[PDB]
Each structure stands twice: as C-alpha cells, then as structure tokens.
PDB file of C-alpha atoms in Angstrom:
ATOM      1  CA  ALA A  42      -0.056   0.321   0.235  1.00  0.00           C
ATOM      2  CA  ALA A  43       2.458   2.944   1.177  1.00  0.00           C
ATOM      3  CA  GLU A  44       4.872   3.082   4.229  1.00  0.00           C
ATOM      4  CA  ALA A  45       8.142   1.399   4.773  1.00  0.00           C
ATOM      5  CA  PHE A  46       9.680   2.489   1.238  1.00  0.00           C
ATOM      6  CA  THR A  47       9.414   6.085   3.084  1.00  0.00           C
ATOM      7  CA  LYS A  48      11.513   5.676   5.752  1.00  0.00           C
ATOM      8  CA  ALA A  49      13.922   3.853   3.915  1.00  0.00           C
ATOM      9  CA  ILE A  50      14.448   6.724   1.419  1.00  0.00           C
ATOM     10  CA  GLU A  51      15.298   8.687   4.793  1.00  0.00           C
ATOM     11  CA  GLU A  52      19.070   8.686   6.242  1.00  0.00           C
ATOM     12  CA  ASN A  53      19.738   7.096   3.013  1.00  0.00           C
ATOM     13  CA  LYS A  54      19.201   9.944   1.003  1.00  0.00           C
ATOM     14  CA  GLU A  55      22.211   8.231  -1.529  1.00  0.00           C
ATOM     15  CA  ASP A  56      20.788   5.305  -2.606  1.00  0.00           C
ATOM     16  CA  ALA A  57      18.984   5.047  -5.820  1.00  0.00           C
ATOM     17  CA  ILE A  58      17.468   1.786  -4.772  1.00  0.00           C
ATOM     18  CA  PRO A  59      14.533   3.098  -1.968  1.00  0.00           C
ATOM     19  CA  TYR A  60      13.674   5.699  -4.800  1.00  0.00           C
ATOM     20  CA  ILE A  61      12.399   3.165  -7.776  1.00  0.00           C
ATOM     21  CA  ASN A  62      10.608   1.480  -5.200  1.00  0.00           C
ATOM     22  CA  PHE A  63       8.672   3.639  -4.365  1.00  0.00           C
ATOM     23  CA  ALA A  64       8.348   4.527  -7.726  1.00  0.00           C
ATOM     24  CA  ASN A  65       7.392   1.240  -8.599  1.00  0.00           C
ATOM     25  CA  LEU A  66       4.519   1.482  -5.762  1.00  0.00           C
ATOM     26  CA  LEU A  67       3.153   5.128  -6.902  1.00  0.00           C
ATOM     27  CA  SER A  68       2.848   3.432 -10.662  1.00  0.00           C
ATOM     28  CA  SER A  69       0.506   0.467  -9.319  1.00  0.00           C
ATOM     29  CA  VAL A  70      -1.465   2.908  -7.260  1.00  0.00           C
ATOM     30  CA  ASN A  71      -1.943   5.278 -10.141  1.00  0.00           C
ATOM     31  CA  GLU A  72       0.653   8.270  -9.462  1.00  0.00           C
ATOM     32  CA  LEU A  73       2.325   8.363 -12.310  1.00  0.00           C
ATOM     33  CA  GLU A  74       3.484  11.698 -12.798  1.00  0.00           C
ATOM     34  CA  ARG A  75       5.314  11.151  -8.910  1.00  0.00           C
ATOM     35  CA  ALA A  76       6.527   8.209  -9.955  1.00  0.00           C
ATOM     36  CA  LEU A  77       8.385   9.855 -13.009  1.00  0.00           C
ATOM     37  CA  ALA A  78       9.670  12.483 -10.293  1.00  0.00           C
ATOM     38  CA  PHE A  79      11.106   9.377  -8.260  1.00  0.00           C
ATOM     39  CA  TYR A  80      12.717   7.818 -11.084  1.00  0.00           C
ATOM     40  CA  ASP A  81      13.994  11.240 -12.120  1.00  0.00           C
ATOM     41  CA  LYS A  82      15.686  11.240  -8.426  1.00  0.00           C
ATOM     42  CA  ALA A  83      17.259   7.634  -8.868  1.00  0.00           C
ATOM     43  CA  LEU A  84      18.748   8.469 -12.708  1.00  0.00           C
ATOM     44  CA  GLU A  85      19.899  11.170 -10.619  1.00  0.00           C
ATOM     45  CA  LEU A  86      21.685   9.095  -8.507  1.00  0.00           C
ATOM     46  CA  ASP A  87      22.859   6.516 -10.767  1.00  0.00           C
ATOM     47  CA  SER A  88      22.640   7.284 -14.278  1.00  0.00           C
ATOM     48  CA  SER A  89      23.595   3.124 -14.552  1.00  0.00           C
ATOM     49  CA  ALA A  90      19.989   1.823 -12.830  1.00  0.00           C
ATOM     50  CA  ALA A  91      18.254   0.258 -15.313  1.00  0.00           C
ATOM     51  CA  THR A  92      15.028  -0.552 -13.458  1.00  0.00           C
ATOM     52  CA  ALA A  93      14.269   3.488 -13.160  1.00  0.00           C
ATOM     53  CA  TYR A  94      15.131   3.457 -16.947  1.00  0.00           C
ATOM     54  CA  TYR A  95      12.605   0.325 -17.345  1.00  0.00           C
ATOM     55  CA  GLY A  96       9.767   1.712 -14.686  1.00  0.00           C
ATOM     56  CA  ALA A  97       9.764   5.373 -16.093  1.00  0.00           C
ATOM     57  CA  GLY A  98       9.171   3.569 -19.529  1.00  0.00           C
ATOM     58  CA  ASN A  99       6.258   1.595 -18.599  1.00  0.00           C
ATOM     59  CA  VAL A 100       4.841   4.694 -17.341  1.00  0.00           C
ATOM     60  CA  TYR A 101       5.404   6.281 -20.882  1.00  0.00           C
ATOM     61  CA  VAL A 102       3.761   3.105 -22.347  1.00  0.00           C
ATOM     62  CA  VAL A 103       0.242   3.483 -19.942  1.00  0.00           C
ATOM     63  CA  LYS A 104       0.164   7.414 -21.080  1.00  0.00           C
ATOM     64  CA  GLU A 105       1.047   6.022 -24.857  1.00  0.00           C
ATOM     65  CA  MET A 106       4.090   8.697 -25.388  1.00  0.00           C
ATOM     66  CA  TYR A 107       6.263   5.294 -27.038  1.00  0.00           C
ATOM     67  CA  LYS A 108       8.392   8.251 -28.522  1.00  0.00           C
ATOM     68  CA  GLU A 109      10.044   8.865 -25.151  1.00  0.00           C
ATOM     69  CA  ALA A 110       9.093   4.854 -23.949  1.00  0.00           C
ATOM     70  CA  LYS A 111      11.481   3.699 -26.736  1.00  0.00           C
ATOM     71  CA  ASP A 112      14.020   6.648 -25.031  1.00  0.00           C
ATOM     72  CA  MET A 113      13.816   5.208 -21.975  1.00  0.00           C
ATOM     73  CA  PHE A 114      13.465   1.240 -22.715  1.00  0.00           C
ATOM     74  CA  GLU A 115      16.471   1.523 -24.506  1.00  0.00           C
ATOM     75  CA  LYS A 116      18.526   3.198 -22.250  1.00  0.00           C
ATOM     76  CA  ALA A 117      17.504   0.706 -20.314  1.00  0.00           C
ATOM     77  CA  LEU A 118      18.638  -2.290 -22.003  1.00  0.00           C
ATOM     78  CA  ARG A 119      22.070   0.276 -22.958  1.00  0.00           C
ATOM     79  CA  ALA A 120      22.074   0.126 -18.725  1.00  0.00           C
ATOM     80  CA  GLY A 121      22.379  -3.726 -18.545  1.00  0.00           C
ATOM     81  CA  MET A 122      18.719  -4.892 -18.433  1.00  0.00           C
ATOM     82  CA  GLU A 123      18.293  -7.834 -20.719  1.00  0.00           C
ATOM     83  CA  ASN A 124      15.075 -10.175 -20.520  1.00  0.00           C
ATOM     84  CA  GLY A 125      12.153 -11.185 -22.389  1.00  0.00           C
ATOM     85  CA  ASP A 126      10.157  -8.548 -21.183  1.00  0.00           C
ATOM     86  CA  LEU A 127      12.381  -5.600 -21.967  1.00  0.00           C
ATOM     87  CA  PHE A 128      12.859  -6.860 -25.853  1.00  0.00           C
ATOM     88  CA  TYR A 129       9.012  -7.316 -26.179  1.00  0.00           C
ATOM     89  CA  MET A 130       8.374  -3.507 -24.756  1.00  0.00           C
ATOM     90  CA  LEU A 131      10.914  -1.826 -26.906  1.00  0.00           C
ATOM     91  CA  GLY A 132      10.056  -4.126 -29.652  1.00  0.00           C
ATOM     92  CA  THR A 133       6.310  -3.485 -29.818  1.00  0.00           C
ATOM     93  CA  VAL A 134       6.901   0.360 -28.691  1.00  0.00           C
ATOM     94  CA  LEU A 135       9.190   0.145 -31.899  1.00  0.00           C
ATOM     95  CA  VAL A 136       6.455  -1.409 -34.087  1.00  0.00           C
ATOM     96  CA  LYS A 137       3.728   1.766 -32.989  1.00  0.00           C
ATOM     97  CA  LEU A 138       6.186   3.729 -34.066  1.00  0.00           C
ATOM     98  CA  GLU A 139       6.668   2.841 -37.617  1.00  0.00           C
ATOM     99  CA  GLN A 140      10.388   1.308 -38.012  1.00  0.00           C
ATOM    100  CA  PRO A 141       9.766  -2.476 -38.310  1.00  0.00           C
ATOM    101  CA  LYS A 142      13.446  -2.749 -39.224  1.00  0.00           C
ATOM    102  CA  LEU A 143      14.243  -2.170 -36.183  1.00  0.00           C
ATOM    103  CA  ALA A 144      11.553  -4.008 -34.033  1.00  0.00           C
ATOM    104  CA  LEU A 145      12.565  -7.102 -35.368  1.00  0.00           C
ATOM    105  CA  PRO A 146      16.114  -8.021 -34.088  1.00  0.00           C
ATOM    106  CA  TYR A 147      14.454  -7.554 -30.023  1.00  0.00           C
ATOM    107  CA  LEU A 148      10.992  -9.116 -31.482  1.00  0.00           C
ATOM    108  CA  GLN A 149      13.173 -12.298 -32.404  1.00  0.00           C
ATOM    109  CA  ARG A 150      14.944 -12.196 -29.088  1.00  0.00           C
ATOM    110  CA  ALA A 151      11.885 -12.030 -27.145  1.00  0.00           C
ATOM    111  CA  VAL A 152      10.431 -15.356 -28.702  1.00  0.00           C
ATOM    112  CA  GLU A 153      13.826 -17.097 -28.345  1.00  0.00           C
ATOM    113  CA  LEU A 154      13.933 -16.451 -24.473  1.00  0.00           C
ATOM    114  CA  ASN A 155      10.581 -17.194 -24.012  1.00  0.00           C
ATOM    115  CA  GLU A 156       9.141 -19.704 -26.773  1.00  0.00           C
ATOM    116  CA  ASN A 157       5.599 -19.837 -25.351  1.00  0.00           C
ATOM    117  CA  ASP A 158       4.934 -15.906 -25.341  1.00  0.00           C
ATOM    118  CA  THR A 159       2.288 -16.078 -27.714  1.00  0.00           C
ATOM    119  CA  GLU A 160       1.470 -12.579 -27.728  1.00  0.00           C
ATOM    120  CA  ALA A 161       5.565 -11.497 -28.586  1.00  0.00           C
ATOM    121  CA  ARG A 162       5.029 -14.397 -31.304  1.00  0.00           C
ATOM    122  CA  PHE A 163       2.183 -12.948 -33.150  1.00  0.00           C
ATOM    123  CA  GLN A 164       4.028  -9.760 -32.936  1.00  0.00           C
ATOM    124  CA  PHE A 165       7.313 -10.721 -34.407  1.00  0.00           C
ATOM    125  CA  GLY A 166       4.901 -12.335 -37.022  1.00  0.00           C
ATOM    126  CA  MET A 167       3.488  -9.248 -38.099  1.00  0.00           C
ATOM    127  CA  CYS A 168       6.665  -7.483 -38.524  1.00  0.00           C
ATOM    128  CA  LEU A 169       8.727 -10.243 -40.514  1.00  0.00           C
ATOM    129  CA  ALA A 170       5.755 -10.530 -42.796  1.00  0.00           C
ATOM    130  CA  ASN A 171       5.980  -6.326 -43.127  1.00  0.00           C
ATOM    131  CA  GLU A 172       9.837  -6.871 -43.897  1.00  0.00           C
ATOM    132  CA  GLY A 173       9.552  -9.481 -46.378  1.00  0.00           C
ATOM    133  CA  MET A 174      10.531 -12.311 -44.931  1.00  0.00           C
ATOM    134  CA  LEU A 175       7.569 -13.967 -45.372  1.00  0.00           C
ATOM    135  CA  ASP A 176       7.524 -17.319 -45.256  1.00  0.00           C
ATOM    136  CA  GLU A 177       8.718 -16.918 -41.696  1.00  0.00           C
ATOM    137  CA  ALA A 178       6.230 -14.747 -40.795  1.00  0.00           C
ATOM    138  CA  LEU A 179       3.902 -17.798 -41.460  1.00  0.00           C
ATOM    139  CA  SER A 180       6.053 -20.061 -39.467  1.00  0.00           C
ATOM    140  CA  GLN A 181       5.895 -17.958 -36.597  1.00  0.00           C
ATOM    141  CA  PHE A 182       1.743 -17.349 -37.293  1.00  0.00           C
ATOM    142  CA  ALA A 183       1.430 -20.903 -37.736  1.00  0.00           C
ATOM    143  CA  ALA A 184       3.251 -21.366 -34.034  1.00  0.00           C
ATOM    144  CA  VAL A 185       0.737 -18.956 -32.497  1.00  0.00           C
ATOM    145  CA  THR A 186      -2.239 -21.035 -33.819  1.00  0.00           C
ATOM    146  CA  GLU A 187      -0.630 -24.208 -31.739  1.00  0.00           C
ATOM    147  CA  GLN A 188      -0.789 -22.038 -28.726  1.00  0.00           C
ATOM    148  CA  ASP A 189      -3.643 -20.276 -29.152  1.00  0.00           C
ATOM    149  CA  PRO A 190      -5.973 -21.929 -31.304  1.00  0.00           C
ATOM    150  CA  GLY A 191      -8.873 -19.167 -30.502  1.00  0.00           C
ATOM    151  CA  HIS A 192      -6.630 -16.157 -32.608  1.00  0.00           C
ATOM    152  CA  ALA A 193      -8.812 -15.281 -35.250  1.00  0.00           C
ATOM    153  CA  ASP A 194      -5.683 -12.031 -35.678  1.00  0.00           C
ATOM    154  CA  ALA A 195      -3.243 -14.339 -36.666  1.00  0.00           C
ATOM    155  CA  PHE A 196      -5.186 -16.722 -39.074  1.00  0.00           C
ATOM    156  CA  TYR A 197      -6.002 -13.206 -40.575  1.00  0.00           C
ATOM    157  CA  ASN A 198      -2.679 -11.853 -40.803  1.00  0.00           C
ATOM    158  CA  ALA A 199      -1.558 -15.137 -42.461  1.00  0.00           C
ATOM    159  CA  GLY A 200      -4.462 -15.185 -45.038  1.00  0.00           C
ATOM    160  CA  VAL A 201      -2.409 -11.659 -45.700  1.00  0.00           C
ATOM    161  CA  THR A 202       0.996 -13.269 -45.865  1.00  0.00           C
ATOM    162  CA  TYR A 203      -0.267 -15.740 -48.191  1.00  0.00           C
ATOM    163  CA  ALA A 204      -1.674 -12.424 -50.653  1.00  0.00           C
ATOM    164  CA  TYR A 205       1.640 -11.352 -51.018  1.00  0.00           C
ATOM    165  CA  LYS A 206       2.912 -14.573 -51.376  1.00  0.00           C
ATOM    166  CA  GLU A 207       0.894 -14.636 -54.964  1.00  0.00           C
ATOM    167  CA  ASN A 208      -1.754 -17.918 -53.535  1.00  0.00           C
ATOM    168  CA  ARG A 209      -5.601 -17.068 -53.784  1.00  0.00           C
ATOM    169  CA  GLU A 210      -5.907 -20.894 -52.288  1.00  0.00           C
ATOM    170  CA  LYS A 211      -4.248 -21.102 -48.902  1.00  0.00           C
ATOM    171  CA  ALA A 212      -4.628 -17.044 -48.491  1.00  0.00           C
ATOM    172  CA  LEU A 213      -8.691 -17.929 -48.492  1.00  0.00           C
ATOM    173  CA  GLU A 214      -8.084 -21.193 -46.019  1.00  0.00           C
ATOM    174  CA  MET A 215      -6.912 -18.966 -43.413  1.00  0.00           C
ATOM    175  CA  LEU A 216      -8.753 -16.266 -43.818  1.00  0.00           C
ATOM    176  CA  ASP A 217     -12.290 -18.379 -43.541  1.00  0.00           C
ATOM    177  CA  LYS A 218     -10.773 -20.059 -40.271  1.00  0.00           C
ATOM    178  CA  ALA A 219     -10.216 -16.142 -38.903  1.00  0.00           C
ATOM    179  CA  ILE A 220     -14.071 -15.769 -40.050  1.00  0.00           C
ATOM    180  CA  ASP A 221     -14.877 -19.343 -38.452  1.00  0.00           C
ATOM    181  CA  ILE A 222     -13.425 -18.336 -35.390  1.00  0.00           C
ATOM    182  CA  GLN A 223     -14.907 -14.607 -34.778  1.00  0.00           C
ATOM    183  CA  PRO A 224     -17.998 -14.055 -37.202  1.00  0.00           C
ATOM    184  CA  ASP A 225     -17.713 -10.313 -36.846  1.00  0.00           C
ATOM    185  CA  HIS A 226     -14.084 -10.253 -37.884  1.00  0.00           C
ATOM    186  CA  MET A 227     -14.741  -6.937 -40.453  1.00  0.00           C
ATOM    187  CA  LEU A 228     -10.813  -6.733 -41.985  1.00  0.00           C
ATOM    188  CA  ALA A 229     -11.159 -10.631 -42.330  1.00  0.00           C
ATOM    189  CA  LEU A 230     -14.362  -9.863 -44.044  1.00  0.00           C
ATOM    190  CA  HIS A 231     -13.156  -6.830 -46.412  1.00  0.00           C
ATOM    191  CA  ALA A 232      -9.823  -8.829 -46.786  1.00  0.00           C
ATOM    192  CA  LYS A 233     -11.967 -12.021 -48.602  1.00  0.00           C
ATOM    193  CA  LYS A 234     -14.472  -9.608 -50.916  1.00  0.00           C
ATOM    194  CA  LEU A 235     -10.851  -9.284 -52.736  1.00  0.00           C
TER     195      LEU A 235
END
C-alpha cells in the first residue's frame, strides 16, 4: 500500500534503489507523474540504474508516449537490462512508431527467450511479414495457432501474408478460419471480398 518505502529513503538519501521501489509502488497506485519524479531522482543518483529507465518507460507506455518509451527502454537495455519483457516492450513500442526494421531483432529475441509467449510471437510474425520475410512470418503465425487456436488475428494476418505470396488458395483457407473463429472480423471480411 504505502509506508516502509518512505522511511527507507530517509537516512539513505544517497541510494537509488529505495527511490525506484517507491516509484514502482506509485505506478501501481495510479500516481504516474509522481512515479516519474522518483525515477528521475534515482537516475540523478545512478544514471546506470536500468530498472529506473524501465519503470519510467512503462509509465510512458501507459500514457502512450511511445517515442519517449522507446528512449527509456533503449536506455534500460543500454544500462544492462536484458530479458524477455524488455525486448518485448521495446519491440512492440518500435512497432507503434513505424520502423519495424528496428523492432525485428528485439522481437526475435523475446520469442527465443520465451518460446511460450504467444503475444510476442504474434508481433514478431507481423513484423517479419512486413519486412518481406514472408515464409518465416507464416512459421511464426502457425506456432501462434498451435498455442492459441482461438487466435483469429493470427489466421487473418496469415491470410494476408499468402496474398503477398501470390496465392488465392491458402489465403482464403486461413481467412476462412478467422471468420470461423470470430464471425464479426470485419477486416477478414473485407479482405475476403477481394
């Protein structure tokens, strides 16, 4: 809820960690701006504190300031943080910002580091297909289908991939299964009428 973290800061004015912990608490309690002020303080004390860059980044994500979230996440990564979640948040934010050519290596990594993360794998798929690497996109879309068979979006994006492969067979096949799952998939609907 609150206390502890507050006093831990007192007489420890010099340590970044307690400021980070308090900022983490403030995030979870909807005090986003104040969280940012505490992450700021931590970074003023230790400009290498990866978790402060990461914590601030998530705040930026919630507020949908993606350019600033990219900045924070890449600083986290630069300061040392390397894990599935970070590569994911960075990958995905790089997507929202156009520039897939940049999301690709980090999204690739998130899958590697967690082959079970359906969400990451679907985002990697879309980025691969976007970049021209279309067969490896289908590789990924298929694996998403194996873990989550209720994943209509994957089927649709598979459907769209096959279109760029010049094939009005498997395209309509995969597209069917998307409407099959979600009867109100308007994009799958409009895609099929072509």
